[PDB]
């Protein structure tokens, strides 16, 4: 299969850590019609390093945006309403990741932060395409992050809880 | 001073001997009105690491493009987040007494911005040259004129 998309995103850890040990780490994400996988990125050698995870596309049930953090650190803060920039800013495209989206499957939700709105859209559209004929697609989801033992949107404590919001219209 | 430009470029190592195979290393480059410095880029830390070098701006005598290598490997063969940090096809040179310094940019636009700012910043220097070497110093001599001294006067008149 061909690699449909390849990007460096900031991935939130799943952990099982108290003391709000939420980790955000940059990973190289790859998408094919069969799997969404992620790896460490070997900057010096300019290639992907060891595999950190893999999700078979058929197990994905939902992919949508996530309501952003209320007061995120500067590296995840959403830029100016403007741009008109006919040029991708090299540094910010690998240092700032303000646009989160979620990939929902069996093992709870995976949260991914994109450096740009365009790129997040590109990934959500393509993921929606590759999961289109999946057996267990859900028509509800949690619009907000799961943090500190519960979803911010409905306060439920189970990660596999049915979504509290019906999709689109 | 304020940072005028910040970019990750592929830097060519100074060829120690005429038989030494060329080494290229990605470095974070910073330009201010006083210095042009480069550091390792700590990807995981998302910031500059150990300083690798610095060039006093007052010491720069010329900044121009360099004719590219004829058959470069994939990494330097002629905006997508990945290619902008993995592919570096556009070279430019910073000339000074202890130079030249060869830097490869991922894009033509970025190289154009750096050359423009560097020219701004060296504008009032006392030893600016009117001639330069259009090609790389390779395996012991400049490809452009065959002169074997890196500090040799440039073989081409700089007509802007
Ligand atoms: Na690559
Ligand atoms: Na920075
Ligand atoms: Zn909810
Ligand atoms: Zn020459």
What are the chain B neighbours of A88 within 8 Å (beta carbons)?
79-81, 84
For residue A43, give the nearest of B6, B43, B81 by CB distance: B43
**Of residues B101, B100, B139, the one with CA closest to residue B22:** B139
Q: Which residues of B95-104 are buried (b: 16+ CB within 10 A; e: fewer)?
A: bbeebbbbbb
What gap in Å lies between CA B148 and CA A122, rounded to an integer? 52
**Integer-rounded Cα radius of gyration of chain B:** 15
- The H or E element containing residue B121 is helix B108-122
* Beta carbons of A7 and B82 less than 8 Å apart: yes
Q: Which of helix, strand or coil describes residue B65?
A: strand
Instruction: Give the distance (Å) from ligand 1 centre to CA of residue A47.
Output: 5
Residues of A with CB under 8 A from a CB of B: 6-8, 25-26, 41, 43-44, 46-47, 75, 87-88, 90-91, 93-95, 115, 119
- The H or E element containing residue A140 is strand A140-141
- Please say whether the dihedral angle defined by the alpha carbons of residues B58, B61, B62 and B67, taken in this order, is positive or negative: negative
Residue pair B157/B145 in contact (Cβ under 8 Å)? The answer is no
* Beta carbons of A26 and B7 less than 8 Å apart: no
Angle, vertex CA A10, rays to CA A69 and CA A16, nearest 5: 75
Min Cα separation A25/chain B (Å): 8
* Beta carbons of B82 and A44 less than 8 Å apart: no
Start-end of H helices in A17-169: 92-95, 117-131
Min Cα separation B5/chain A (Å): 10
- Burial of residue B142, with CB atoms counted within 10 A of its CB: 0-12 exposed, 13-18 middle, 19 or more buried: buried
User: Which pair of tokens denotes residue B127?
Assistant: 């030893």
Return the residue of A nearest to B30 by Cα.
Answer: A91
**Integer-rounded Cα radius of gyration of chain A:** 16
Instruction: Give the distance (Å) from ligand 1 centre to CA of residue A148.
Output: 37
What gap in Å lies between CA B75 and CA A68, rounded to an integer? 37
Residue A13 CA, chain-centre distance (Å), reads: 11
Angle, vertex CA B136, rays to CA B134 and CA B141, nearest 5: 110
For residue A8, give the nearest of B8, B81, B106 by CB distance: B81
What gap in Å lies between CA B79 and CA A118, rounded to an integer? 12
- The H or E element containing residue A21 is none
Instruction: Tell me which of B41, B85, B113 to substitute to probe the interface with A (most A C-beta atoms closer than 10 Å).
Output: B85
Residue pair B57/B119 in contact (Cβ under 8 Å)? The answer is no
Preceding amide of B100 cis, omega within 30: yes
Instruction: Please report the number of interchain residue pairs, chain A to chain B, with beta-carbon separation below 8 angstroms.
Output: 47
Return the residue of B nearest to A43 by Cα.
Answer: B43
The full set of domains in chain A, from first to last, is 1-169 (2.30.29.30)
What gap in Å lies between CA B69 and CA A157, rounded to an integer? 60
CB atoms within 10 A of CB B94: 22
**Of residues A45, A12, A49, A34, the one with CA closest to residue A134:** A34
What gap in Å lies between CA A58 and CA A137, rounded to an integer? 10
Place of tokens 């050359």: B115
- Sequence-distant (6+) residues with CB within 8 A of A92 are A115
Min Cα separation B78/chain A (Å): 17
Min Cα separation A27/chain B (Å): 10
Return the residue of B nearest to A85 by Cα.
Answer: B79
Q: What are phi and psi of A147, to 5 degrees?
A: -145, 140
User: Which pair of tokens denotes residue A70?
Assistant: 């209320």
What gap in Å lies between CA A15 and CA A165, rounded to an integer? 26
How many residues would you count in chain A? 169
* Beta carbons of B46 and A75 less than 8 Å apart: yes
* Closest ligand to the CA of A66: 3
Instruction: Give the distance (Å) from ligand 1 centre to CA of residue A98.
Output: 24
SS (H, E, C) B70-120: CCCCHHHCCCCCCHHHHCCCEEEEEEECCCCEEEEECCHHHHHHHHHHHHH
DSSP state letter for B24: E
Residue pair B64/B93 in contact (Cβ under 8 Å)? The answer is yes
What gap in Å lies between CA B61 and CA A128, rounded to an integer? 55
For residue B7, give the nearest of A6, A7, A90 by CB distance: A90
**Of residues B48, B16, B11, the one with CA closest to residue B140:** B16
- Sequence-distant (6+) residues with CB within 8 A of A73 are none
Place of tokens 């330097």: B76
- Sequence-distant (6+) residues with CB within 8 A of A148 are A20
């Amino acid at each position: 299969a061909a690699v449909i998309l390849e990007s460096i995103f900031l991935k939130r850890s799943q952990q099982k850590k108290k003391t709000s040990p939420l980790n955000f780490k940059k990973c190289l994400f790859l998408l094919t019609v069969h799997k969404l996988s992620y790896y460490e990125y070997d900057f010096e050698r300019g290639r992907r390093g060891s595999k950190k995870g893999s999700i078979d596309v058929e197990k994905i049930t939902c992919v949508e945006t996530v309501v952003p953090e209320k007061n995120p650190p500067p590296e995840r803060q959403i830029p100016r309403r403007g741009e008109e920039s006919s040029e991708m800013e090299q540094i910010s495209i690998i240092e700032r990741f303000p646009y989160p989206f979620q990939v929902v499957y069996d093992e709870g939700p995976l949260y991914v932060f994109s450096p740009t709105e365009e790129l997040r859209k590109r990934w959500i559209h393509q993921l929606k395409n590759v999961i289109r004929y999946n057996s267990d697609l859900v028509q509800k989801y949690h619009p907000c992050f799961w943090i500190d033992g519960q979803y911010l949107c409905c306060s439920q404590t189970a990660k596999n809880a049915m979504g509290c919001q019906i999709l689109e219209n």
